[PDB]
């Protein structure tokens, strides 16, 4: 029988080509989105367009370390992420060009930091974030969409960002569901990075079956609900195909997203700049 969830209730949604016929077994994987909105809140003149997103993007590495090292103190079961997340071994034998851009061995975890192998030093030695991000754009879901977790126009990583608020996402694939561990992770992230007036829903799991000058402020609204719904249809099948995983006769379970809000100050926004981007922009 399908896995049991008490507080978060079930919901079904198959993309076209009580209990539906296909909702029988356990899902191929659960999807957990940590949705991050960030801003350099005290803005100034003399800041360049790049300063809108470089400093916010530099926090993805610390955020990923925090998620990966999270342990449920006082646990009655699953303790760490490694005990619960989906394990991947090797990309397809063809398509190895995405080595050091997608996780081969271990936990399935995607984030913008993957563009730099989750290496803050490599990010700091990078003079053109836009070029690095778009280096592999051409169909199936793009590498930028896979790593950012958002359509791409919502991200705000561009030279024409007027609101100066950048959003991205960390994507976790989980083999098992643990209410205690997942609630602990959400509580940890909301303690570390409180969101001002976040109203995201947190009580529904969506099962998807695939057939064949002034200060800026971070806002949370109905446009941020079920953000994954504005990704491509082939997003998840294409993500899982890279690891020889098929969603043909099976389904996945998307859990409610965990909000995160980052406020950065001019000191960090300055300390992060690569000296060679001042001359260009």
């Amino acid at each position, epitope marked *: 029988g399908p896995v049991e969830f*008490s*507080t978060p209730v079930k919901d079904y949604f198959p993309p076209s080509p009580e209990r539906p016929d296909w909702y029988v077994g356990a899902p191929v994987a659960y999807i957990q989105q940590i949705f991050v909105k960030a801003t350099v809140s005290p803005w100034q003149k003399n800041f360049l367009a790049v300063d809108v997103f470089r400093s916010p993007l530099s926090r993805v590495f610390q955020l990923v370390e925090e998620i990966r090292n999270h342990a*449920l*103190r*006082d646990s*009655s*079961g699953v303790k760490s992420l490694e005990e619960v997340c989906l394990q991947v071994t090797d990309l397809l034998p063809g398509l190895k060009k995405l080595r050091n851009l997608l996780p081969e061995h271990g936990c399935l975890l995607l984030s913008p930091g993957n563009f730099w192998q989750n290496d803050r030093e490599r990010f700091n030695a990078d003079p053109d974030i836009i070029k690095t991000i778009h280096q592999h754009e051409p169909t199936s879901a793009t590498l930028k969409d896979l790593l950012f977790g958002l359509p791409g126009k919502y991200s705000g990583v561009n030279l024409y960002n007027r609101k100066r608020v950048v959003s991205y996402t960390v994507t976790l694939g989980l083999q098992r569901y643990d209410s*205690r561990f997942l*609630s*602990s992770l959400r*509580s*940890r992230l909301k*303690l570390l990075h409180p969101s001002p007036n976040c109203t995201l829903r947190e009580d529904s799991i969506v099962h998807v079956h695939f057939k064949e000058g002034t200060e800026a402020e971070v806002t949370w609204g109905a446009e941020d609900e079920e953000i994954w719904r504005k990704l491509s249809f082939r997003h998840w099948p294409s993500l899982f195909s890279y690891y020889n995983i098929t969603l043909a006769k099976r389904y996945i379970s998307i859990l409610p997203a965990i909000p995160v809000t980052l406020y950065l100050n001019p000191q960090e926004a300055l300390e992060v700049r690569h000296p060679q981007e001042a001359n260009r922009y």
Partner: antibody
Amino acid sequence: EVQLQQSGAELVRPGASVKLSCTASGFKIKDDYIHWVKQRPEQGLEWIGRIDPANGHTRYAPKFQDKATITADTSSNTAYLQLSSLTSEDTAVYYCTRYNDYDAFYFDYWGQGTTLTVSS
Amino acid sequence: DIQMTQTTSSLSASLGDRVTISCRASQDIRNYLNWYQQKPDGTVKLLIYYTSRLHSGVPSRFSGSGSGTDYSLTISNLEQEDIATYFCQQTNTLPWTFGGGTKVEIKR
């Protein structure tokens, strides 16, 4: 409306065994851990242990590993703490509580407290 | 394992006065400190969690601050209802440890 009703005051002989009880109302004990705390004047409060009623998985402070035994009945919505090999040093007030946030681990709601007296 | 110590076991104050309780941890606890209030009746009630966060229903005159090893609760204006004992509990390392309570009383 969350309440944790506790049993009445207890008087027992040294060497006997007591079972204090704590009945929840307004929520199901299955949904949270249930903890027992001990207040003793001139020593303050100290943590005894907790139980996860969904799993029946208990944990204790190392002081009470051989002293306390925590259990829970979900049908009756009641947690229990059993003290064994009682001595005078077990005369104290025992609080039943829980927590609701699983990173902060704050005890949001408490029972009124049960006084246990051990005297010949 | 972690020993929490409150400097003053008793404190005398007056209505409308600013009061401050403080406690020190034997080691870093990464802001995992909760503040509880116990009435003379014996009923306990959570005041603060994670060193600054107000529990729902707590009057806004209570506040918390601190870091590293040193933490402090503050009552902006002592009300007649704020006569009680105050405990600080650390939830950083697994066996939860409370600090010896600090009593608050009127001047006499």
